[PDB]
Amino acid sequence: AQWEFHPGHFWMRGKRPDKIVDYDEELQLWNVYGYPESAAILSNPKVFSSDTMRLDPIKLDEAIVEGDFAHTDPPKHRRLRGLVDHAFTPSLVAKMESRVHGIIHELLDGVEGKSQFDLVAEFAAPLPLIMISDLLGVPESDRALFRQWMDKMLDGSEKFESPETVLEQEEELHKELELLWEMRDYWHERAAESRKRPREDLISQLVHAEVDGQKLNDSQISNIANRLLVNGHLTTAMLIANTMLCLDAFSDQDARVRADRSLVPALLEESMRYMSPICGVGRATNSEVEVAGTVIPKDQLLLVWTGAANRDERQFEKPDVFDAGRSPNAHLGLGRGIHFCLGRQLARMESKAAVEILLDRLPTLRADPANPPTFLQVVDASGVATLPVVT
Ligand code: HEM
């Protein structure tokens, strides 16, 4: 519908890309919009690196960014990703799903007196933030410190699609550095405290974990926790809020889901296909490559538009139709390959619980017609930042 998407997100307005691959001369980067091409790129990490900072004229020191396996390639990626995967022990997962319904009901008890409110600010954002905070074992008071950090990182994320001078890049890189130091000194004290009093959380698991036979340092622990927070917060808030927005918009699909509650998981996946919280990811070419019959030189920044790939009619029938029960749905919303979303199970468990409970407790919940949603002002994300609702 007449929704105010990021102007760069042409696929949300039902437009096909003119070329599967193009070059942005003003930003000095390459764009890929096709599904088979994107999928192949994500499955070829040896050629398409996730270490995009390699191409920056000004960089952070490697010791400072290590542990952020989202920007790490083989052979070192698997170790890092492995510890964290492992760290998500079967007890932890169980404990998380045991807590999510409690958190959700608690949130909605918070808006019980309100006939009108912002679903994102009141519900959809706090829930995944709270879940990850508890998983990391930080006190509730520290959830504040995280929402603070997440607007600085949301601020730095914004205007990434504007051209930047080498000096502006230095300025951004220095504010990023100050924030990494504050987090590093934070996680340093959570590590100490966890060593002093271990608990049933992820940090407790991390202080014992080892790479190359050595335990992790403050920078590794900090960069892993930061990556869980940043990757798992607003992505999940958007999936929850996009999903309620789409149900409101497509009353036929809404009716299907209310009538047949077994559709909710497939609804969430289709929500991801159709309005992809992460709608593009960055890659750097290690060598010269051909993509959709287009030659891309060595050392280039390539934006893989998973949001656009997800509307590719070569992969999906009627890709611009929202189908709550869509199957099969091998969308790229969660990535593909070695960097495939680590928190996928938690994100699906949370979102499912959230939608289900919104449907049961607030069956009259609707998008406020006097007050439309706004979309997140970040080019690699397709989702709502505000969703005023009325009961
Ligand atoms: C709707 C919810 C989510 C979406 C759409 C999403 C999306 C994605 C995507 C597209 C990637 C691939 C990145 C790339 O290839 O460059 C990814 C990876 C990742 N996700 Fe998620 N994510 C979500 C929720 C979560 C949650 C809840 C967590 C943690 C609690 C999380 C943690 C991570 C991590 C650590 C990675 C990096 C894995 C690696 O690089 O090996 N995400 N996610």
Distance, in Å, from the CA atom of 335 to the CA atom of 219, rounded to the nearest integer, reads 26
Q: Which of 235, 274, 276, 352 most suits a substitution to test ligand 1, by most atoms within 8 Å of the C-beta?
A: 235
Helices (H) and strands (E) in the chain, counts: 15, 14
The CATH number for 183's domain is 1.10.630.10
Give me the residue label for tokens 């060595």. Answer: 298
- Among protein residues, the one with the nearest Cα to ligand 1's atom 3 is 235
Instruction: Give CA angle at 238 (233, 244), nearest 5°.
Output: 140
258's enclosing H/E stretch is: helix 251-259
Angle at 161 (CA atoms; ends 159, 162), nearest 5 degrees: 70
Structural domain span for residue 103: 1-391
CA dihedral (229, 234, 237, 238) positive or negative: negative
Could you list the residues known to form a binding site, using ranges: 77, 81, 231, 283, 339, 341
Indicate if ligand 1 lies below 6 Å from the C-beta of 305: no
CB-CB contact of 388 with 367 (8 Å): yes
DSSP SS3 for 61:
coil
Tokens of 282: 């960055």
With the most atoms of ligand 1 within 8 angstroms of its CB, the residue from 268, 273, 341, 346 to mutate is: 341
Amino acid occupying residue 202: L
228 lines ligand 1 (CB under 6 A): yes
Question: Measured from the CB, is residue 341 less than 6 Å from ligand 1?
Answer: yes
Burial class (CB in 10 A: 0-12, 13-18, 19+), 85: exposed
Tell which residue, 219, 235, 223, 272, has the closest CA to residue 154.
Answer: 235
The residue type at 354: A
Cβ atoms of 235 and 228 within 8 Å: the answer is: no
The residues facing 285 across adjacent strands are: 48
Residue 384 and residue 245: Cα distance in Å, rounded? 9
Q: Which atom of ligand 1 is nearest to the CA of 281?
A: 16
Whether 127 contacts 350, CB under 8 Å: yes
Q: Which atom of ligand 1 is nearest to the CA of 337?
A: 15
Atom 38 in ligand 1: which residue has the minimum CA distance?
339
DSSP conformation letters of 88-130: S-HHHHHHHHHHHHHHHHHHHHHTTT-SEEEHIIIIITHHHHH
Contact 277, 379 (CB under 8 A): no
Integer-rounded Cα Rg, in Å, for the chain is 21
Structure tokens at 112: 């019980």
CA–chain centroid gap for 82, Å, is: 19
What CA–CA distance (Å, rounded) separates 201 from 34? Answer: 40
**Are 374 and 386 spatial neighbours (Cβ–Cβ below 8 Å)?**
yes
Q: Which atom of ligand 1 is closest in space to residue 72's alpha carbon? A: 40
From ligand 1's centre to the CA of 278, what distance in Å? 9
How close is the Cα of 196 to the center of ligand 1, in Å?
Answer: 31
Give the three-class secondary structure for 4: coil
Residue of minimum CA distance from atom 9 in ligand 1: 334
Q: What domain count does the chain have? A: 1
